[PDB]
Design a protein around this ligand. Structure first.
Ligand code: CLA
Ligand code: CLA
Ligand code: CLA
Ligand code: CLA
Ligand code: CLA
Ligand code: CLA
Ligand code: CLA
Ligand code: CLA
Ligand code: CLA
Ligand SMILES: CC(/C=C/C=C(C)/C=C/[C@@]12O[C@]1(C)C[C@@H](O)CC2(C)C)=C\C=C\C=C(C)\C=C\C=C(C)\C=C\[C@@]12O[C@]1(C)C[C@@H](O)CC2(C)C
Ligand code: SF4
Lengths: 169, 61, 41, 160, 180, 80
């Protein structure tokens, strides 16, 4: 028996072999009954959204926009003060982005049905970082780790605002 | 038609009328209903096979 | 735990779990926002 | 206004109903002692009754001669939160349910043992299909266009 | 089918713009319950011509102030119909009769299931020889120009109706037609 | 007495004859099926109409058909 590298008292999970964040961490075996490509796509998207949202917290409490609506240093209270109209526009824009970036196939059964789709690979690289394949793997691992850390931190900041109410500081 | 062929039942008084079945064996003797067809759906009596005539089955392309 | 998980995948257990979860979130919506006769918006 | 009804904010019988309910609850409250859980429960009942009546008053709700909110479901968007918006919400949810059920039926209908997978659900595949129902309006008007939504003549018919 | 019909240009790539596939629903289930592509194209031509005429009829009377002598001077299309219906009933009756005769002669009812002797918006009607002798590509280009102008007029009339109903729906409208 | 008819869809499996409680059906020689036998109904005066005969019929829509008709003390199953 091999046993996992992360959880040393557990057997090595299956389906994670050719990935860019494999430390053998899957005690519940989510990769066995869920497609690993979909799981990586979801992890990357959740991580990127969490990173953007954490940066949004830190900037919002600091900078903010001119106007009476955009005057709440607290993100949770800003979600309510801003009203539904600005939020629904963000929702519709995110939907438009989702549709055009995945080119129609948006669901768990439709995406990766034909393969030829690296999980999380939207081809988005205008600044050109990533031409060298040597640093590409390191950049992918850094993105994954930062995304996970940002998921934890996004939960932390949101719940700090809920239990205190003032801000993050 | 032959063994393993897919046919459509043309007999109107059939639980598998307009449906497709699999031919089990076509008898070469002088019997009236030589074609034996097996279906996936059991009829109201529980059977899933029946003998059909040559003009009561239409082979699917 | 290979056949126990298959037993939990049977129709009665799955229906009971799904209906219990469904009644649960319905009852909790009606606890946190009671007496909702019209759409909140 | 519509149909001879009047807003509940200006309906005297509505306020009479609220006052009578509150008075009954307070009379019930009188027969218990101090800050005991029964009094707390009755006070919560009174508070919830007042909140519900206030919300119904400030809700563009039309009340009849009995002081009860009447629903205007002719289709006008003015009273759109009474029927039309809940109608859209239910249509979305029920279409989701029907779509995921149909997709599961058609998916396990092409396996070796279709009947086995109906009493013993393939929970992985079931979860895969169920979370994909959020696009049911789009999926339905992408399968109807391709002719994959409707059968034509393989459907069975009785003798006559 | 849409590949060999007039109506698509560079604005929507090179392909016929049809997000909802409405041109291909006629061949779908049912003998006929949804219109054929011929009916849809005739509806194109009719709606576009009507929209162009209506744009002229809301711009010229309402803004430029030009009025038929014995007709109400109402620079408002939401009341001009009734005002002329009372003021000059005979004129409106004759207009309705002429419209009915024109449409009955050019009936498009066999277009619903596809077929008929006429073409899409044929109508004859070439008095001043604009298509007297032309190349086939030239006639197709003129038809495409007509269809696109009809679509633009449809959009303009819809914008008029929207701004009248929901104020501020078309921002530049009142700055581009300063008078009502 | 009831009427019992036999149709050439008979496969001669004898299940009708051995299910008749009143000895109405019997197997007779035939050349229309593999078994070379077909059911016959020569004693329909004893037919009671219980339709056990066509409950044991394996052919698609039956090869023995019982049409209930005029009643008799034999067909009504009257021991009195
Ligand atoms: C998950 C992302 C996310 C979400 C949902 C929000 C949501 C919100 N922000 Mg916000 N913000 C974000 C990220 C986000 N922010 C980031 C990363 C920054 C740093 C630039 C800011 C800086 C910021 C300021 C300064 C203010 C807000 C404010 C607000 C609120 C009102 C909407 C508004 O005016 O936004 C305006 C948001 C921006 C101008 C930021 C630009 C949008 C970012 C960059 C996301 C862009 C993603 C991109 C389009 C797609 C990626 C590429 C694609 C190929 C994947 C609303 C609650 C306002 C508020 O209520 O104050 C409390 C306000 O004053 N935000
Ligand atoms: C910690 C920050 C971080 C890092 C290291 C990466 C790293 C990466 N991203 Mg990424 N991304 C991030 C944040 C980050 N992302 C955020 C917040 C968003 C949301 C707007 C995205 C949205 C995004 C998309 C949509 C795509 C990428 C892609 C990529 C890959 C190619 C680009 C590259 O080499 O960038 C190197 C990164 C840096 C030099 C860091 C600069 C700061 C690479 C693995 C592409 C990809 O996944 O291809 C497989 C791609 O299509 N990213
Ligand atoms: C990056 C991740 C991260 C970090 C750094 C923090 C850090 C903190 N959280 Mg926190 N939190 C997080 C994620 C995180 N959280 C998530 C994901 C959630 C959602 C469940 C919460 C929900 C949460 C609540 C509800 C509260 C905090 C509180 C706190 C503060 C008290 C720390 C404490 O008691 O330590 C104790 C732990 C140890 C000593 C570890 C011993 C080993 C501290 C600043 C508390 C606070 O005062 O916030 C202002 C508080 O009430 N957090
Ligand atoms: C399965 C559906 C379901 C869902 C979505 C929730 C959801 C929730 N429950 Mg909950 N609950 C459920 C079933 C469910 N409950 C059942 C079946 C019971 C037992 C009768 C409870 C008993 C229960 C208690 C006792 C409490 C919650 C609380 C809560 C909230 C915070 C956790 C959250 C809204 C907590 C809460 O919000 O109260 C402040 C809390 O204290 N729940
Ligand atoms: C019994 C037949 C019947 C039917 C089928 C309808 C159907 C409808 N009515 Mg209606 N109505 C009816 C009787 C009926 N009404 C009666 C008897 C009255 C009393 C006078 C009203 C008074 C009424 C009002 C006041 C309004 C409606 C509206 C609507 C529409 C709802 C919004 C909508 O679909 O926008 C999409 C509609 C279309 C795209 C139009 C073409 C279809 C819908 C088409 C609302 C509306 O928007 O009307 C258009 C609206 O404001 N109705
Ligand atoms: C009366 C409305 C109407 C109708 C019936 C059509 C019908 C048609 N258009 Mg058209 N179009 C219209 C308005 C309309 N258009 C307007 C206003 C514009 C300008 C934006 C266009 C721009 C346009 C382009 C650029 C092209 C077409 C094309 C077509 C043809 C194929 C698409 C189809 O089947 O649509 C059927 C449409 C309907 C049945 C209308 C339903 C409308 C519903 C009620 C929603 C409307 C509100 C949103 C068909 C003859 C294509 C073509 O000619 O292919 C060769 C093509 O390339 N149209
Ligand atoms: C969709 C096409 C359409 C429709 C339904 C109408 C309908 C109407 N127009 Mg009108 N009109 C149109 C196109 C249309 N017009 C065009 C294209 C022009 C530009 C030549 C005009 C110029 C016009 C004037 C100058 C006047 C009307 C007027 C009227 C009203 C009385 C009928 C009349 O005298 O017509 C007259 C029609 C013409 C002189 C030419 C039409 C071809 C009536 C509501 C009259 C009215 O009541 O004013 C408010 C009026 O004085 N129209
Ligand atoms: C070719 C036959 C014909 C004849 C003899 C007339 C004769 C007449 N028309 Mg007339 N008209 C015709 C075709 C004809 N019209 C057509 C085809 C149309 C549709 C464009 C109209 C639209 C029309 C209008 C709108 C009005 C007349 C009016 C008149 C009368 C004033 C002169 C006169 C009796 C006017 C009238 O009777 O006013 C009292 C008037 O207002 N006509
Ligand atoms: C039952 C209704 C009905 C029927 C079957 C017909 C039949 C006919 N009409 Mg006609 N017409 C009708 C009503 C009707 N008309 C009405 C109300 C008018 C307006 C006054 C006209 C004006 C008219 C003209 C001007 C001409 C015809 C012509 C014709 C003939 C062939 C061309 C054609 O159909 O295009 C015309 C098509 C229409 C006018 C469409 C009418 C659509 C109707 C109104 C819909 C009714 C259906 C509805 C479900 C009925 C309800 C039943 C019950 C509930 C009451 C044909 C014999 C032509 C002719 O005579 O050929 C030599 C011609 O030139 N029609
Ligand atoms: C709990 C949590 C993470 C828990 C992580 C744990 C235990 C990790 C444990 C480990 O790492 C260690 C310790 C060691 C590792 O080696 C092993 C593991 C085991 C892996 C994240 C919560 C994360 C929670 C998140 C992200 C919640 C985000 C909430 C948002 C955005 C809410 C928005 C709103 O609330 C407002 C603002 C207004 C409302 O009215 C409307 C809405 C919209 C609802
Ligand atoms: S009824 Fe059927 S079973 Fe009973 S006797 Fe007549 S035939 Fe035999």
């Amino acid at each position: 028996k091999v046993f996992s590298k992360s959880v040393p008292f557990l057997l090595k999970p299956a389906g994670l072999d050719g990935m860019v964040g494999d430390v053998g961490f899957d005690p519940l075996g989510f990769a066995t009954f869920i497609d690993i490509r979909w799981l990586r796509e979801a992890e990357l998207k959740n991580g990127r959204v969490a990173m953007l949202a954490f940066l949004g917290f830190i900037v919002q409490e600091f900078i903010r926009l001119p106007g009476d609506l955009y005057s709440e240093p607290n993100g949770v209270k800003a979600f309510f003060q801003v009203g539904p109209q600005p939020l629904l526009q963000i929702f519709l824009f995110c939907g438009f982005l989702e549709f055009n970036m995945h080119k129609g196939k948006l669901t768990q059964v439709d995406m990766f049905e034909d393969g030829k789709r690296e999980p999380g690979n939207f081809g988005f690289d205008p600044l050109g970082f990533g031409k060298d394949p040597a640093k590409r793997e390191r950049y992918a691992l850094a993105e994954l780790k930062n995304g996970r850390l940002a998921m934890i931190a996004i939960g932390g900041l949101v719940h700090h605002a809920l239990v205190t109410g003032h801000a993050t500081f | 038609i032959q063994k393993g062929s897919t046919v459509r039942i043309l007999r109107k008084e059939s639980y598998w009328y307009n449906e497709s079945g699999t031919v089990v064996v076509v008898d070469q003797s002088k019997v009236r209903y030589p074609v034996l067809v097996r279906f996936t759906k059991v009829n109201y009596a529980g059977t899933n096979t029946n003998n059909f005539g040559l003009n009561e089955v239409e082979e699917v392309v | 735990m290979k056949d126990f998980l298959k037993y939990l995948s049977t129709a009665p257990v799955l229906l009971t779990a799904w209906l219990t979860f469904t009644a649960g979130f319905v009852i909790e919506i009606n606890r946190f926002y009671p007496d909702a006769l019209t759409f909140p918006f | 206004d519509i149909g001879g009804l009047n807003p509940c904010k200006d309906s005297e019988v509505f306020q009479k109903r609220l006052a009578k309910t509150v008075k009954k609850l307070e009379n019930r409250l009188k027969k218990y002692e101090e800050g005991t859980p029964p009094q707390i429960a009755i006070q919560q009942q009174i508070t919830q009754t007042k909140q519900r009546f206030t919300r119904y008053a400030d809700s563009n709700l039309l009340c009849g001669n009995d002081g009860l909110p009447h629903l205007i479901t002719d289709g006008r968007w003015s009273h759109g939160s009474e029927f039309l918006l809940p109608s859209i919400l239910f249509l979305y949810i029920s279409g989701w349910i029907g779509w995921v059920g149909r997709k599961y039926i058609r998916t396990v209908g092409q396996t070796s043992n279709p009947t086995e997978k109906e009493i013993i659900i393939d929970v992985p595949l079931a979860i895969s299909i169920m979370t994909s129902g959020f696009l049911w309006p789009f999926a339905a008007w992408q399968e109807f266009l391709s002719g994959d939504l409707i059968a034509s003549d393989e459907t069975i018919t009785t003798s006559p | 089918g849409l590949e060999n019909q007039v109506g698509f240009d560079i604005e929507t790539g090179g392909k016929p713009w049809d997000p909802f596939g409405f041109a291909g629903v006629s061949e779908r289930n049912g003998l006929g319950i949804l219109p054929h592509i011929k009916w849809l194209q005739e509806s194109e031509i009719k709606h576009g011509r009507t929209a162009m005429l209506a744009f002229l009829g809301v711009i010229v009377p309402g803004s430029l102030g030009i009025y038929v002598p014995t007709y109400p001077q109402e620079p408002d299309f939401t009341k001009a119909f009734s005002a002329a219906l009372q003021s000059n009933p005979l004129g409106m009756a004759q207009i309705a009769l002429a419209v009915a005769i024109i449409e009955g002669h050019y009936y498009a009812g066999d277009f619903w299931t596809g077929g008929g002797d006429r073409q899409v918006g044929a109508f004859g009607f070439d008095p001043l020889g604009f298509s007297k002798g032309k190349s086939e590509a030239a006639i197709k280009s003129m038809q495409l120009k007509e269809i696109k102008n009809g679509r633009l007029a449809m959009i303009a009339m819809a914008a008029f109706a929207s701004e009248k109903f929901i104020p501020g729906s078309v921002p530049l409208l009142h700055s581009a037609f300063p008078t009502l | 007495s009831h009427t019992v008819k036999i149709y050439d869809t008979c496969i001669g499996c004898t299940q009708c004859v051995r299910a008749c409680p009143t000895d109405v059906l019997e197997m007779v020689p035939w050349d229309g099926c593999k078994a070379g036998q077909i059911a016959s109904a020569p004693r329909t005066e004893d037919c009671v109409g219980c339709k056990r005969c066509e409950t044991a019929c394996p052919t698609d829509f039956l090869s023995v058909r019982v049409y209930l008709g005029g009643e008799t003390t034999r067909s009504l199953g009257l021991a009195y």
